[PDB]
Design a protein around this ligand. Structure first.
Ligand SMILES: CCCCCCCCCCCCCCCC(=O)OC[C@H](COP(=O)(O)O)OC(=O)CCCCCCCCCCCCCCC
Ligand SMILES: CC(C)CCC[C@@H](C)[C@H]1CC[C@H]2[C@@H]3CC=C4C[C@@H](OC(=O)CCC(=O)O)CC[C@]4(C)[C@H]3CC[C@]12C
Ligand SMILES: [Ca+2]
Ligand SMILES: [Zn+2]
Lengths: 669, 78
């Protein structure tokens, strides 16, 4: 056989020429012809009302997708069997869904799809409103990580059907129209729904992009609903609603980066930030840094005035969040200056110096007390969710270790004749590490600035990717260190210096720890080429070890470092399109840290009727939400019929309508 | 609880079947039907000219985005 004989494998019963002409009369719009064919179908002829096309197109279905209400009413007048034609009218977004609702195998829809689920999937406000007025219910999905008998039974029976039904339910719940129509609090519903869908995307590894898109849709809906505010009174009603900015705190808690970083929200936060400061930002920059320095040197007088007179005007100037931010920054800068003074010896016991270190201890105890106080309120999850909290916890633990080691050395104990594990030496080393961490904590203050802010946020965002590539490189380093130590440990010599930290580098690969250090320092070129030589004249062993060193250098410098550069290029291009959003979210968190009344004093001094009101607040919030939902519905309806464009379906609708008008004109004459 | 009982929280105000018939008559663009609806709207009956849809579309607005100049003139005449 030199030719392929093509035949239909999946054959059907097809249609008679009379039934084909009847379907063509349905398609074109011959009302007289379909009426005559239906009248012939009442009597016992070949044409039946519930005919099935080989494509599964019942006459009611092709009548529905042609948007001809008279044809649909004609078929439902003669009791044509209705299966999932309501779903086809809903998916097409056709106003004949009313006629399908009041009217008393192969399906193109999943059996778990109900009319309300599909109407919410299509996001049509009118059809959703019609179905809810008729009375519909979406089944309640279970918890994200639950192990009840029903879920495991459905997973044992059909895991695909269970996952698809859960995804369809969450797609229906996450639609903007269903939240705008059927939810009591659309903002809270959107926040909790986005949180639930994010947890589902984390739990369900498959369908992860679907749940992430649904969470993004919920966040984007919340942002657009907030975008419809027309007065500052409505904004203060929304943001300060609780069931003080309680809703803004909730949006920060639910990671709603688009509800925040909105110009109205940022305007309100800036008004509450420079409170009682008319035209602060509309000033020259030099005057701004001059008055910032003036407040900075004047931190302790304001702190003492707050500690002795909170109701004084100078005791209320510190209560401004921006002024207290400058106060805390000045306190931290003075502490770092004291650390620099401490950085600028024959006694085993080291007492604190009579000037420098003695006032340093109040800042250390203030940092410790502030960390315990901040850990006590809010919880420990948000403590570990902030990396700066991990950094200052490490710094405070190191400072406590130095304090304890100094106390131990004072109550228990030349410098060159000390043991290498002397408590004074360990105390000085940990003090230097804590100084590094304390001076590295200054990068968290870049969030307030508008220039270093987004840069700092993005460069802190790619650190997870840095850690992944560091894991890969650490595995490579461990492999090559194992091999080089295995080759070179037979040639260990015992020479005051033994290691890579002297002028004549020797015994670089004799120890596994020394091999790790030698391979670590070879990235920067600080390991010379004579470290691969041995005392004996074993040129083969030296060549093989130098080949290992060359292969490791080639990987870790040419290959791995350039893969790291490429992946930081991709990450930075991916996260620079949202840099303003993340920076403004972090700046909002920094601002609301200082918005509260507690913790007003800096760290050197920080250690020293109802039902009627609730009903009125609920009524005001419901009125504002009604106005917002009306504005949002009108806007998205006006947006909906403009940016959608023209498909081939509406061209077919135009052709069918013009053909129907032509055939009606022919019937008239 | 097994199913979520979806309802309408923002109930607003619905419209009479005569008012809905008038509104979809303006939406379809039939001159005679809108003219007759406004004839019965001339006398103080159920159909009023100042009818506001729950979607927010007054009949003048429905004539406005339908680009029917004759329908807009007919509405502004009444
Ligand atoms: C970890 C998984 C990911 C990485 C997977 C491996 C990918 C990389 C594979 C590299 C294989 C080793 C290559 C040879 C290295 C070696 O040991 O080479 C070592 C020897 C030197 O021997 P001595 O160290 O004894 O002097 O090189 C030579 O003998 C000279 C001739 C061969 C030179 C080959 C060079 C190939 C290119 C490498 C440099 C590229 C730099 C480009 C700059 C623009
Ligand atoms: C060796 C010691 C003394 C440290 C030396 C450096 C500091 C003097 C610098 C480094 C980073 C600076 C900070 C960088 C950014 C800002 C934000 C900027 O303030 C704002 O932008 C406030 C909010 C606003 O204006 O909207 C000026 C103060 C501050 C905290 C700066 C204060 C001074 C800092 C700590
Ligand atoms: Ca902290
Ligand atoms: Zn369950």
């Amino acid at each position: 056989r030199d030719r392929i004989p093509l035949r239909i494998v999946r054959a059907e019963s097809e249609l008679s020429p009379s039934e084909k002409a009847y379907l063509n009369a349905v398609e074109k719009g011959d009302y007289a012809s379909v009426k005559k064919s239906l009248e012939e179908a009442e009597i016992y002829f070949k044409i039946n009302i519930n005919c099935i096309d080989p494509l599964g197109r019942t006459a009611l279905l092709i009548a529905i997708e042609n948007e001809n209400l008279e044809l649909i009413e004609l078929l439902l007048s003669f009791n044509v069997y209705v299966g999932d034609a309501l779903l086809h009218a809903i998916r097409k977004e056709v106003v004949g869904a009313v006629e399908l609702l009041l009217n008393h195998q192969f399906s193109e829809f999943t059996p778990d799809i109900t009319p309300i689920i599909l109407a919410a999937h299509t996001n049509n406000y009118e059809i959703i409103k019609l179905l809810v007025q008729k009375g519909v219910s979406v089944p309640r999905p279970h918890e994200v990580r639950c192990n009840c008998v029903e879920c495991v039974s459905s997973s044992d029976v059909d895991s695909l059907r269970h996952s698809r039904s859960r995804l369809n339910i969450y797609k229906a719940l996450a639609s903007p129209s269903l939240i705008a129509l059927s939810s009591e609090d659309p903002f809270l519903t959107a926040f909790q729904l986005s949180w639930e869908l994010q947890e589902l995307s984390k739990v369900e590894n498959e369908f992860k992009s679907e749940y992430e898109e649904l969470s993004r849709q919920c966040k984007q809906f919340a942002k657009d609903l907030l975008d419809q505010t027309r007065s500052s009174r409505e904004l203060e009603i929304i943001l300060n609603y609780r069931d003080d900015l309680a809703r803004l705190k909730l949006a920060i808690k639910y990671r709603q980066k688009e509800f925040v970083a909105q110009p109205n929200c940022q305007q309100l936060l800036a008004s509450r930030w420079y409170d009682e400061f008319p035209g602060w930002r509309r000033r020259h920059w030099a005057v701004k840094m001059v008055t910032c320095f003036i407040i900075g040197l004047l931190f302790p007088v304001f702190s003492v005035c707050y500690l002795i007179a909170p109701k004084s005007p100078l005791g209320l100037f510190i209560r401004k969040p921006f002024i207290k931010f400058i106060c805390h920054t000045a306190s931290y800068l003075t502490f770092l200056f004291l650390l620099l003074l401490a950085s600028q010896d024959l006694n085993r016991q080291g007492p604190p110096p009579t000037i420098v270190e003695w006032m340093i201890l109040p800042w250390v105890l203030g940092f410790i007390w502030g960390e315990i106080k901040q850990m006590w309120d809010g919880g420990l999850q948000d403590y570990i969710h902030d990396w700066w909290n991990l950094m200052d916890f490490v710094m405070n633990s190191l400072y406590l270790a130095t304090i304890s080691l100094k106390i131990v050395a004072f109550v228990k104990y030349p410098r060159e004749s000390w043991d290498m594990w002397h408590p004074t030496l360990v105390a000085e080393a940990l003090f230097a590490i804590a100084n590094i961490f304390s001076s590295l904590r200054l990068i968290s203050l870049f969030t307030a600035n508008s220039h270093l802010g987004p840069l700092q946020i993005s460069l802190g965002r790619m650190l997870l990717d840095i850690l992944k590539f560091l894991f890969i490189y650490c595995l490579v380093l461990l492999a090559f260190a194992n091999g080089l130590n295995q080759l070179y440990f037979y040639y260990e010599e015992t020479l005051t210096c033994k290691g890579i930290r002297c002028e004549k580098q020797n015994n670089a690969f004799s120890t596994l720890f020394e091999t790790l250090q030698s391979l670590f320092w070879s990235i920067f070129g600080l390991i010379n080429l004579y470290v691969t030589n041995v005392k004996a004249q074993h040129e083969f062993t030296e060549f093989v070890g130098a080949t290992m060193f060359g292969t490791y250098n080639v990987i870790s410098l040419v290959v791995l470092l350039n893969m790291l550069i490429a992946m930081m290029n991709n990450s930075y291009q991916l996260i620079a399109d949202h840099a303003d959003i993340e920076w403004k979210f972090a700046r909002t968190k920094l601002w609301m840290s200082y918005f509260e009344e507690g913790g007003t004093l800096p760290t050197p001094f920080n250690v020293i009727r109802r039902a009627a009101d609730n009903l009125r607040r609920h009524h005001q919030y419901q009125e504002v939400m009604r106005n917002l939902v009306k504005r949002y519905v009108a806007a998205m309806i006006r947006d909906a019929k403009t940016e959608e464009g023209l498909t081939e379906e509406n061209f077919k609708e135009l052709k069918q309508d013009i053909s129907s008008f032509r055939f009606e004109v022919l019937g008239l004459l």
